[PDB]
Design a protein around this ligand. Sequence first.
Ligand code: 7YK
Ligand code: 7YK
Lengths: 465, 467
Amino acid sequence: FNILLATDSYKVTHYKQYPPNTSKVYSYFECREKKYEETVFYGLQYILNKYLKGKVVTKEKIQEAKDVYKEHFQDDVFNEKGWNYILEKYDGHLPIEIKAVPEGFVIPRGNVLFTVENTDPECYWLTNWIETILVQSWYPITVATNSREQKKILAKYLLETSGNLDGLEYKLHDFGYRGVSSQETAGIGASAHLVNFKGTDTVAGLALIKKYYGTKDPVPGYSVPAAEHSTITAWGKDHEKDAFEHIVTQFSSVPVSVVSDSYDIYNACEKIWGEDLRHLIVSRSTQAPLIIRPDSGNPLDTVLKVLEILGKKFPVTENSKGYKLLPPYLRVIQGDGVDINTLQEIVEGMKQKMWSIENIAFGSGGGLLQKLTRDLLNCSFKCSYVVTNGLGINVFKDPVADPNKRSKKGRLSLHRTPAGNFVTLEEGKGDLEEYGQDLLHTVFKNGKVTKSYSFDEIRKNAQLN
Amino acid sequence: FNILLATDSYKVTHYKQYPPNTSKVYSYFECREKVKYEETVFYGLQYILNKYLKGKVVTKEKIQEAKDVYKEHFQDDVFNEKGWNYILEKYDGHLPIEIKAVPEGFVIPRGNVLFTVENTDPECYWLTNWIETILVQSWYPITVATNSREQKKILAKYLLETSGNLDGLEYKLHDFGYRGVSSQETAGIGASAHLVNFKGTDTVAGLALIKKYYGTKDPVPGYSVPAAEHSTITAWGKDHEKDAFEHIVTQFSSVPVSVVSDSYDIYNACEKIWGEDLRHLIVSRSTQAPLIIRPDSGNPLDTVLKVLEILGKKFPVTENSKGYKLLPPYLRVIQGDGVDINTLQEIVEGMKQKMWSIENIAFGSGGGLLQKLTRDLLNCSFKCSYVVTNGLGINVFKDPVADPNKRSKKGRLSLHRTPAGNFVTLEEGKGDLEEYGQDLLHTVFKNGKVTKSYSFDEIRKNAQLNI
Ligand SMILES: C[C@@H]1CC(=O)N(C2CCOCC2)N=C1c1ccc(NC(=O)N2Cc3ccncc3C2)cc1
Ligand SMILES: C[C@@H]1CC(=O)N(C2CCOCC2)N=C1c1ccc(NC(=O)N2Cc3ccncc3C2)cc1
């Protein structure tokens, strides 16, 4: 990895475009305000450690970048001297100071989340060089936020239909490993989901958390044995029952998920699970349920019909809230077509049919880790303050046709209001001590990580009310 | 990187689930059949084969790590240590797998086999689908390359209709997506996939990926020019926008320069700053070094049309041989906000209805080009179609009652040209009848070795448009 090659091309040319005698460029990140009213701040620590800290500039990395940019631009516009300055003066450590809200913090839209500034006047150009790498923090923020919004929906309907939150942290399982754009993305996104839940198939998330954050537990997320279409269909179309019997017998004393829609989900539920193999299901322990997995058709209609079938083949109870509950050896997971909208539709449709949310879990792949963009929370990095000829000026954009893109002015700070909410003060007004101390902390300075959070602290910060 | 930790957790348990006495699992990848996206660019497998699958990928230390992690993750011992140990001792940790694939850059209709995977040692029946997770990530380069090519087709059609040729087509869609993707690795992969179709990119990560895994005869596969951002304009102060514009076009007076012009008022900047105060610095520029005015907010169509209306009243407009208006060659526009395949179509159609040549415009696309895409868009999918159990081959498949679109193919597969020059996927080993020409799938990986490679230049040639 070469930080000289990890920016937008046009930023290679920005050192020639700032006003003459600019000593300071100060920039900030927010989730701009215009429904996702509050964001989980997560993922900066990964970027600081993997890409920004320590000796990130070498002679060899400068020469590589020079040679690439000469061909890319068909011109010699690369700031070799500026990068050489960093190498010679700071042994290739970035003269940058980053301040940030603590990881796992849940902050309303339109607040400063981190600030960046150069600590050496020669390095005014470096603040926005690193915009591109720091702005990728959009992805872990957005995955963590959207996963937390789904947790709130599951909390609401579980509480209403059961009277408690038992099992909440296992109700949304990450299926997204194959559905993301890269190995690196898999680890980052899986880690962000694990801020809110404990259930994952995206193995890449475990090593990221252990290396960059840390937990008291041996692992931050868990799984159970489960079938796929290849392990049922390999038995032959006339042997689906044989495949089911073998799998639940092999995994007789742990939970096991069995995809049941290879040929006919309703037949598999009513006749195979509900008659032919029923004797192998009703004998299982509460710690080792069969989890029936549909994987096709309209997600709500399919869940409701699977539950109607099982309720007629298995002994159903009525819990203390008046909702129907399968026996504890039998559960359903809907792992197809699940995103925040269909999850809401399913739990609402289950509640209207008097089915406890105790009965159901969700798996989500592309919905959870891939079908998300930087536009969803308007994640954005902007210059708000410069010093030119020794005078500080408040800088901002304010496009005539889009007031939502107006950016904040001057030196920023994050404060508690007298009612306990968050406010971002602009124009250096934090320095009036009318709202108490800045809630941002220095997390990076001059090539060193100066403040960090365990994954356990982050989960506690990200908790639901 | 540890291939034993690079699968879906549940695949760790599949070796206990297949039928006993299974010697072979054969699986295939397609972009299942139902902007229709009728044809896909096959691109990106060679990256995965070289970075993750080839050579000694199993060691004692990787087996023990995986065992230790899975013990805690499952709260249970279920990991196939014996099976992984077998690969280490028998093959020096090289995967006993054969992958056959259509050549990279090939443009194939939906619902065709694009690659197959099978074990070459009967002990390793479980390994075929272990690597499903890593191989199915090929959805991303296929989908970026396909969606970028579908945008090239729209640009080609409107450029040809409004100008009578395709000059500059390979620079009309610029990759702005480095900050808008989910990781560094994704930036390189996605940027490389766009460069199959175009030559302009700011996503620098794409260049090193292509040089290391594919290679070009050119020194670099993609190019850029100087451009402003809001920080380099707004740093001058709100009353000095004109001073920022003047300094930037003067610094970059002999190359193309893109200047974001919407910091405060895009329409004032076009009419009064570029169109009056700094007009003398624009009309003096060479055809090889235009000013490129960049709006970046508002309704993308409305803003492009109004910018062109303003510039056409301040600068000498010609009418080309097709009857479309054309700015002078020292002045162009780039719309780089809110661009995806739908808004690109809307803008060029709106420009054509207002009699503006597509020669006047270029597009930048970030999240639309590299991020706002899922594995669902082309139904990219890997499925088992053939097993051997007690020495007898059986054709296998799924066919869910409530969704016929998820039916999978049966048996040993091959891809052929039809007598009319289309493509057909033969099932149930019927390729062996040789009623069609040669199978188009070639062995690209066997027993830990990459057996066939494509240059980036071959890939671009295979992915060309018809015209
Ligand atoms: C959601 C239920 C409920 C539940 O409480 N658990 C916990 C998980 C922690 O250990 C004790 C049981 N696991 C569950 C569960 C876990 C994994 C699976 N896996 C699953 O169906 N698949 C893995 C996977 C990955 C990618 N595509 C499809 C699938 C199918 C299914 C149910
Ligand atoms: C599309 C026009 C037309 C065109 O023919 N070119 C080619 C490119 C190859 O070299 C000669 C000129 N470049 C163009 C161009 C290149 C880069 C830019 N860059 C740009 O506006 N920005 C880079 C970038 C990245 C991330 N977010 C925003 C921006 C803004 C704009 C126009």
